[PDB]
Scaffold this active site. Structure first.
Site, PDB file in Angstrom:
ATOM      1  N   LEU A  22      13.348   1.644   1.753  1.00 49.16           N
ATOM      2  CA  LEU A  22      13.918   1.333   0.279  1.00 49.16           C
ATOM      3  C   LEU A  22      15.501   1.895   0.287  1.00 49.16           C
ATOM      4  CD1 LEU A  22      11.158   2.600  -1.937  1.00 49.16           C
ATOM      5  CD2 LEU A  22      11.812   0.125  -1.679  1.00 49.16           C
ATOM      6  N   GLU A  30       7.137   4.742 -10.223  1.00 52.56           N
ATOM      7  CA  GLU A  30       7.587   3.415 -10.130  1.00 52.56           C
ATOM      8  C   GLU A  30       6.287   3.172  -8.894  1.00 52.56           C
ATOM      9  OE1 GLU A  30       8.319  -0.355  -9.762  1.00 52.56           O
ATOM     10  OE2 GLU A  30       8.652   0.759  -8.003  1.00 52.56           O
TER      11      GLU A  30
HETATM   12  N1  684 Z   1       7.654  -2.834  -8.482  1.00 56.93           N
HETATM   13  C1  684 Z   1       7.932  -2.562  -7.222  1.00 56.93           C
HETATM   14  N2  684 Z   1       7.432  -3.606  -6.321  1.00 56.93           N
HETATM   15  C2  684 Z   1       7.471  -3.757  -4.926  1.00 56.93           C
HETATM   16  N3  684 Z   1       7.343  -5.073  -4.262  1.00 56.93           N
HETATM   17  C3  684 Z   1       7.710  -2.524  -4.390  1.00 56.93           C
HETATM   18  N4  684 Z   1       7.590  -2.185  -3.095  1.00 56.93           N
HETATM   19  C4  684 Z   1       7.833  -1.080  -2.534  1.00 56.93           C
HETATM   20  C5  684 Z   1       8.120  -1.004  -0.872  1.00 56.93           C
HETATM   21  N5  684 Z   1       7.323   0.288  -0.367  1.00 56.93           N
HETATM   22  C6  684 Z   1       8.109   0.471   0.636  1.00 56.93           C
HETATM   23  C7  684 Z   1       8.752  -0.107   1.519  1.00 56.93           C
HETATM   24  C8  684 Z   1       9.433   0.481   2.741  1.00 56.93           C
HETATM   25  C9  684 Z   1       9.728   1.650   2.888  1.00 56.93           C
HETATM   26  C10 684 Z   1       9.234   2.602   1.874  1.00 56.93           C
HETATM   27  C11 684 Z   1       8.447   2.117   0.943  1.00 56.93           C
HETATM   28  C12 684 Z   1       7.747   3.273   0.104  1.00 56.93           C
HETATM   29  C13 684 Z   1       6.731   2.991  -0.718  1.00 56.93           C
HETATM   30  C14 684 Z   1       5.936   1.729  -1.008  1.00 56.93           C
HETATM   31  C15 684 Z   1       4.622   2.275  -1.158  1.00 56.93           C
HETATM   32  C16 684 Z   1       3.533   1.209  -1.480  1.00 56.93           C
HETATM   33  O1  684 Z   1       2.254   1.472  -1.661  1.00 56.93           O
HETATM   34  C17 684 Z   1       2.089   2.834  -1.519  1.00 56.93           C
HETATM   35  C18 684 Z   1       1.995   3.829  -2.499  1.00 56.93           C
HETATM   36  C19 684 Z   1       2.506   5.278  -2.468  1.00 56.93           C
HETATM   37  C20 684 Z   1       1.841   6.229  -3.151  1.00 56.93           C
HETATM   38  O2  684 Z   1       0.414   6.030  -3.153  1.00 56.93           O
HETATM   39  O3  684 Z   1       2.315   7.027  -3.883  1.00 56.93           O
HETATM   40  C21 684 Z   1       3.961  -0.182  -1.052  1.00 56.93           C
HETATM   41  C22 684 Z   1       5.260  -0.538  -0.736  1.00 56.93           C
HETATM   42  C23 684 Z   1       6.107   0.580  -0.593  1.00 56.93           C
HETATM   43  C24 684 Z   1       8.146   0.118  -3.088  1.00 56.93           C
HETATM   44  N6  684 Z   1       8.147  -0.114  -4.522  1.00 56.93           N
HETATM   45  C25 684 Z   1       7.951  -1.319  -5.199  1.00 56.93           C
HETATM   46  N7  684 Z   1       8.105  -1.391  -6.626  1.00 56.93           N
END
Ligand code: 684
EC number: 1.5.1.3
Length: 186
Positions: A22, A30
């Site tokens: 990210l 979020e």
């Molecule tokens: N609104 C929105 N939409 C998305 N598509 C979205 N994607 C990510 C991608 N991501 C990342 C992509 C690459 C490196 C780091 C990332 C960091 C976090 C996460 C976490 C995800 O689900 C796990 C929940 C964590 C918890 O249980 O606390 C899923 C995707 C994601 C993060 N926020 C988003 N927020």
């Protein structure tokens, strides 16, 4: 199979990724919002389907994959089998939406949530007909090498009160943002 949706968090400069990460520091509330929106189905006995590109699948923190409570499907032309415990692989969104009609998935999937990355979002935006976009607008610029496509306000309309979505500006780590929902028809 239910409604088609994208969900994205995007900086003011339209950025969504940088080197497989990210652009911004973790915004825990979020991330909780992403989790609750993609997981929640009110059709009993079904789960939502999360669709992501090859690079987004490998980039997501590994100790969260596959995304729990959701059917995980990866889009790739390169891979020959679902990678690392993902349940399904398709070559494109259209093929994924077809698979959804085959016996293995037919009475299994409620909503579909496109979760990235850029080429997948472009495919969905290019997909004819109804699409709801859940957009978290992070209100400052972050250096990014991958970007969310333009939102055409001639096609999408904001839906200013949405049940289960906070309206007011939010803040974490000093970084302000707003949860927005858009919808298109055409
Ligand atoms: N609104 C929105 N939409 C998305 N598509 C979205 N994607 C990510 C991608 N991501 C990342 C992509 C690459 C490196 C780091 C990332 C960091 C976090 C996460 C976490 C995800 O689900 C796990 C929940 C964590 C918890 O249980 O606390 C899923 C995707 C994601 C993060 N926020 C988003 N927020």
């Amino acid at each position: 199979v239910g409604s088609l949706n994208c969900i994205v968090a995007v900086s003011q400069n339209m950025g969504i990724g940088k080197n497989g990460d990210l652009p911004w520091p973790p915004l825990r509330n979020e991330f909780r919002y992403f989790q609750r929106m993609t997981t929640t189905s009110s059709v009993e006995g079904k789960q939502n389907l999360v669709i992501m590109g090859k690079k987004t699948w490998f980039s997501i923190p590994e100790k969260n994959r596959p995304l729990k409570g959701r059917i995980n499907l990866v889009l790739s032309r390169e891979l020959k089998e679902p990678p690392q415990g993902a349940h399904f692989l398709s070559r494109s969104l259209d093929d994924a939406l077809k698979l959804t009609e085959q016996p293995e998935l037919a009475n299994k999937v409620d909503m579909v949530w496109i979760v990235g990355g850029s080429s997948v979002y472009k495919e969905a935006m290019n997909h004819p007909g109804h699409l709801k976009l859940f957009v978290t607008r992070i209100m400052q610029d972050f250096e990014s090498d991958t970007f969310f496509p333009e939102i055409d306000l001639e096609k999408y309309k904001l839906l200013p009160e949405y049940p289960g979505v906070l309206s007011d500006v939010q803040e974490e780590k000093g970084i302000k943002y707003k949860f927005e929902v858009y919808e298109k028809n055409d």
